[PDB]
Symmetry: D2
Subunit: 115 residues, 4 copies
């Protein structure tokens, strides 16, 4: 699993469950093409987005649908979504964990990249 997304809720101290995630890959025409999508599990994790074969070098955008998450909890948050844009696999295949920690008016994102 070369690309995993993990989302946590800083208000409740819990995984952020059922968060929609959309991944895009930049195409030669300077356009974002849909690449993979899913929702976080009860553990706040989203596995199985892609395979080593399909996850080639490129610029990828991970959009985490934070506004939909907060609204379902009755909170009107500031951001529309969190976007994580990065070059992947430019030095060869790597495994990427994109983690996000969410509050209504703030979020943090970190990448853990392993060989």
């Amino acid at each position: 699993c070369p690309l995993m997304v993990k989302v946590l809720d800083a208000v409740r101290g819990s995984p952020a469950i059922n968060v929609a995630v959309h991944v895009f890959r930049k195409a030669a025409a300077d356009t974002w093409e849909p690449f993979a999508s899913g929702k976080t599990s009860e553990s706040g994790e989203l596995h199985g987005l892609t395979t080593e074969e399909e996850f080639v070098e490129g610029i990828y955008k991970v959009e985490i649908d934070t506004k939909s998450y907060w609204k379902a909890l009755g909170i009107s948050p500031f951001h529309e979504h969190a976007e994580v844009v990065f070059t992947a696999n430019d030095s060869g295949p790597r495994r990427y964990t994109i983690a996000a920690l969410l509050s209504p008016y703030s979020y943090s994102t970190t990448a853990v990249v392993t060989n």
Copy 2:
């Protein structure tokens, strides 16, 4: 000044100086139109992006050019840039400060909205 941007460097414990910032407004055609831009000052702040008259309700994107910042310091970063996407709402007089704290493999962003 209804919209200000402040950027900090978590590696050096300093304002992030000379960081390029581009602001876009979402247009009816589902496209990002350039709205304002600048570079952060010696205090890490970018003032004067817009006016009360021009900063109407809508969806805005603030792109912070973090990759160039780390490259100028000789540090290998993860993200292409940091993107902050939000709706501006007329809920009474408001000032929006978009703050970002930068590390090579992580960033956090918060909105401070005051009257």
Copy 3:
């Protein structure tokens, strides 16, 4: 003002107002002696804690009374307080800003050190 404290609220997107802050200096007997204290202002800032003459090199602890802050808002928090422990060094003229961003189950702290 060589030492300033700034506190933000990541749930409301606002300065954290009326937060008690206590500063201690490490004494030779491996004990924390009270040094300065106050409450954050309407801007979330606490100025005037010390002077250049009194703020000598040493180990300092800044305790931010986060639990009382969340309790006043009716939100159940995790931490008893946030603690920031650091050495102050005479590396030339310096001003220290200790910033903290608060959520019920998470906080971040950064030092901005400027000349």
Copy 4:
């Protein structure tokens, strides 16, 4: 495993390996008694600190030795350590993950609490 500690490095985008962690529990005499200690693994995680039987209700302090970690990497960081102080098990037994994300002049900590 009712108490686990996870540490990440925001400069390298990696687990923070070999980070020393000391846990203390507040005793009736208003004193911190040593409770457990260990070092993070190659995955940045520290398991096996305590048992359900020994991890009773109380106020606990988790000290993460961040300064020693950064110095071994040739970085002089701002903080002496990160301290996480919290009441545990006051509503019955819970499982606690204390996560910390480290940069030289900044850190963030979050708790994930599950039943």
